[PDB]
Structures are given as structure tokens and as C-alpha cells.
């Protein structure tokens, strides 16, 4: 009768969590969120005007769950697209770093994820008793 993080939905679990984070408002949201898109390869700032900053910040916590450590180079090489070059053939996307640098630092203020001695930023017992516990709060969304 007790779950881990591993036995919930994938897309839906972020949605219920970030909407709770939408009620929180405890995020250092910088001024240039209106202008700067996610990478260079994308064409437009997203159709979400507000909750996209809640979206990426939720899922980066979701990805360090199963993992040991995450630096910043990894989630650069992650984020789901293909660079168009015009009339020349395509190439893989690489993501921007400034929009990921602060949002990784934006969870140290709330006790989630911190630097491992091996060299990456990882969850400890701060999230391991709370982030699972609010993932356990997503079990109410299962019914």
C-alpha cells in the first residue's frame, strides 16, 4: 500500500504537481522569461505564457529521481527537438544554459537537490522525505 516515485503516470504526474507549485509561487522567476526561449533551435517562445517555468522546473526534479547526479551538460543534451538550418540538412538540438543554471539553483532555496561529493547536484533526505511525500500527495489524484 506504499508507493515510490516509480509507479505513477509520467505526463500527468507533472501536471498535478506543477499546478500545486502554481499555488506556491515560491520561485525566483527572472525578468526575461517573456523573451528568451528554451534554446536556439526552437522558433518561438512557448504557447504557455506562465506555467512553462513551472513545467521545466518540475520535470528536472523528476529526472534526478532515478538518477545519481545531474550536472548541466546533461539536460542541455536532453530537451526534445531538431535544429532546422533552412535549406541544409538537420542536426540535433543543444539547449541553452542560463535558463537551466538558475532553475537548478532555484531549488536549493527550498531544500530539494544539492551538490554530491562526486560532482553533481542530487536529492538528499530533504526531498527524500518531502518530495516523495508530495509525490505521495499525488496519490489522491489517482482517484
Amino acid at each position: 500500500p506504499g508507493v515510490s516515485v516509480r509507479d505513477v503516470a509520467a505526463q500527468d504526474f507533472i501536471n498535478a504537481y506543477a499546478s500545486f507549485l502554481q499555488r506556491q509561487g515560491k520561485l525566483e522567476v527572472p525578468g526575461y522569461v517573456d523573451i528568451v526561449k528554451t534554446s536556439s533551435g526552437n522558433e518561438m517562445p512557448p504557447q504557455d505564457a506562465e506555467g512553462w517555468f513551472y513545467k521545466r522546473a518540475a520535470s528536472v526534479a523528476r529526472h534526478i529521481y532515478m538518477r545519481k547526479q545531474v550536472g548541466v551538460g546533461k539536460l542541455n543534451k536532453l530537451y526534445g527537438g531538431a535544429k532546422s538550418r533552412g535549406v541544409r540538412p538537420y542536426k540535433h538540438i543543444d539547449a541553452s544554459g542560463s535558463i537551466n543554471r538558475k532553475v537548478l539553483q532555484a531549488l536549493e532555496k527550498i531544500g530539494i537537490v544539492e551538490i554530491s561529493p562526486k560532482g553533481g547536484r542530487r536529492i538528499s533526505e530533504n526531498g527524500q522525505r518531502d518530495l516523495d511525500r508530495i509525490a505521495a500527495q499525488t496519490l489522491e489524484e489517482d482517484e
Partner: protein, 127 residues
């Protein structure tokens, strides 16, 4: 100690090891329940080894499988190769052979490639 065996299933360079244990019956695909695999259309292909013999023989089992390699399509085929041949190792080490062959006949009447993996490797070009 506990009755425990290992099997594995391959398709197009994609492996799927299996660990069999004994218990209430948990089927773990790489650390997750089996009812959550992302090619949602192919969700019932993994149900096929379970939905051939009835839901009976599993209150004494435990199944943990993990995969590597391949794409998002072959790994669906790889897991049901090791799972279906994983059940017979109980019935070829512990339970008798008349219980073995009745599901052996039940599988290979329906799918020859549930027991025996394919043999269709790729090919080098302009050489």
C-alpha cells in the same frame, strides 16, 4: 533458499534479462509496474504471455526484468521473450513436465516467436 532462475530475450540487439523469485506476484519492468509502457498502442503485446494461461499461477512468483539497447519498439518484443520463457524454468526445475508442456503447447500454437527469437540481422552496404 528461494526458487530463483534467470532468463533473457533478444530482438535486433536489445536484451532483456529476467529475475524470477517467489512471492505474492510482482512484475517489474525496469523498476515499474507493467501497465505503464510508453508505446501505448503496443500495451497489449506485453499482456499476451499473461493472457494466454489465466491469471492463476502467480501468487507464488516474483518477476523483475530490466532491459538495455534497441529502440522504443524492439524492447516491447524483448521483454515478452524473456517473460514467457521465464515461466517454464519453474516448471522445468520444480514443477513437473505435464504442467510444462500444456503451456508450451499453448504458447507455440499462438506464437512461434514467443519462445524462439528471430534471426534477421542487418547487412553491409556498397561493400
Amino acid at each position: 533458499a528461494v526458487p530463483s532462475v534467470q532468463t533473457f530475450g533478444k530482438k535486433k540487439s536489445a536484451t532483456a534479462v529476467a529475475h524470477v523469485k517467489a512471492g505474492k506476484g510482482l512484475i517489474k519492468v525496469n523498476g515499474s509496474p507493467i501497465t505503464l509502457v510508453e508505446p501505448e498502442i503496443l500495451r497489449f503485446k506485453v499482456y499476451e504471455p499473461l493472457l494466454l494461461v489465466g491469471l492463476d499461477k502467480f501468487s507464488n512468483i516474483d518477476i523483475r526484468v530490466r532491459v538495455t539497447g534497441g529502440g522504443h519498439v524492439s524492447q516491447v518484443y524483448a521483454i515478452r521473450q524473456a517473460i514467457a520463457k521465464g515461466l517454464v524454468a519453474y516448471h522445468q526445475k520444480y514443477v513437473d513436465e505435464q504442467s510444462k508442456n500444456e503451456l508450451k503447447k499453448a504458447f507455440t500454437s499462438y506464437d512461434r516467436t514467443l519462445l524462439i527469437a528471430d534471426s534477421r540481422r542487418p547487412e553491409p552496404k556498397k561493400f
